[PDB]
């Protein structure tokens, strides 16, 4: 169906321990395909998905030049933000940037993204119009003014509507056997007595791609949102993801509970019960 490409930049200062580290990673949907790390013995852009390996040496050198120049500029930016906030030269700080493009099931540009954070708090964002900025505070307004003066948004728009979309479509074709394949969850329900009159029902979803999934428990057809323990979706390490949802139920009432699974890889939404 729908698809996205995202780059994630993390720049981390560390006073007394060298220059700020810059890390860039690229994803198509829930698949990482590239990395760069300024701390590596020989910093270079590296493949992280098999379908990107076919790209020529000019691709890899272009990426490396981009990430190397960004490394330098992010170090300047970290110094700038430390100043904007009147911060001591003694603390470690982090700039993060996420950007990229979304496609619909056509797939044409649905929307572009470009957002930054400082120390884990939203700092500045490109608006959906790809023309204007939202600044979080007076410090970010300084960043806004110099991006407005340098016509940054104009460059962002040209990239997000052009090359971002073009290369995403290219990756989606080159990696179609995985990127355009949804693996449904493998599901089952476990039962764990906790006491004489309560037991845990745990609904498992395993081996699914992409990570987007809904697991819900119902009692008599009514969702148990407040009583459902829901873990964060977690990677298996083989491209696939895992999740569970659990409810503590009165013993003997197990059959009044149904687990419901929604995933794009499923022919139909699933309804599961405990099978003694």
């Amino acid at each position: 169906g729908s698809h996205s490409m995202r780059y994630f930049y993390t720049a981390m200062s560390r006073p007394g321990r060298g220059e700020p580290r810059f890390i860039a990673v690229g994803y198509v949907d829930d698949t990482q395909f590239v990395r760069f790390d300024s701390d590596a013995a020989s910093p270079r852009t590296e493949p992280r998905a098999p379908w990107i390996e076919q790209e020529g040496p000019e691709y890899w050198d272009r990426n490396t030049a981009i990430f190397k120049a960004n490394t330098q500029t992010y170090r300047e930016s970290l110094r700038n933000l430390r100043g904007y906030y009147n911060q001591s030269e003694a603390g470690s700080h982090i700039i993060q940037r996420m950007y990229g493009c979304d496609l619909g099931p056509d797939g044409r540009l649905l929307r572009g993204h470009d957002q930054s954070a400082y120390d884990g708090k939203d700092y500045i964002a490109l608006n959906e119009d790809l023309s204007s900025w939202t600044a979080a505070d007076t410090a970010a307004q300084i960043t806004q003014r110099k991006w407005e003066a340098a016509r940054v948004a104009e460059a962002r728009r040209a990239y997000l509507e052009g090359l971002c979309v073009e290369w995403l479509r290219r990756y989606l074709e080159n990696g179609k056997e995985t990127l355009q394949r949804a693996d449904p969850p493998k599901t089952h329900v476990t039962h764990h007595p906790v006491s004489d009159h309560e037991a845990t029902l745990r609904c498992w979803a395993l081996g699914f791609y992409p990570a987007e999934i809904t697991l819900t428990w119902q009692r008599d057809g009514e969702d148990q949102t407040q009583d459902t323990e829901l873990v964060e979706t977690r990677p298996a390490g083989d491209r696939t993801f895992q999740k569970w949802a659990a409810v503590v139920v009165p013993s003997g009432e197990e059959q009044r509970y149904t687990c419901h699974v929604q995933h794009e890889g499923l022919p139909k939404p699933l309804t599961l019960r405990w099978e003694p």
Binding site: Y7, A24, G26, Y59, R62, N63, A65, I66, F67, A69, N70, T73, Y74, E76, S77, N80, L81, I95, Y99, S116, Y123, I124, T143, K146, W147, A150, V152, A155, R156, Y159, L163, C164, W167
Partner: peptide, 13 residues
């Protein structure tokens, strides 16, 4: 593919 470098220099924050 990441955002290519502009003609001049990258604009810092």
């Amino acid at each position: 593919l990441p955002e290519p470098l502009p003609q001049g220099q990258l604009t810092a924050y």
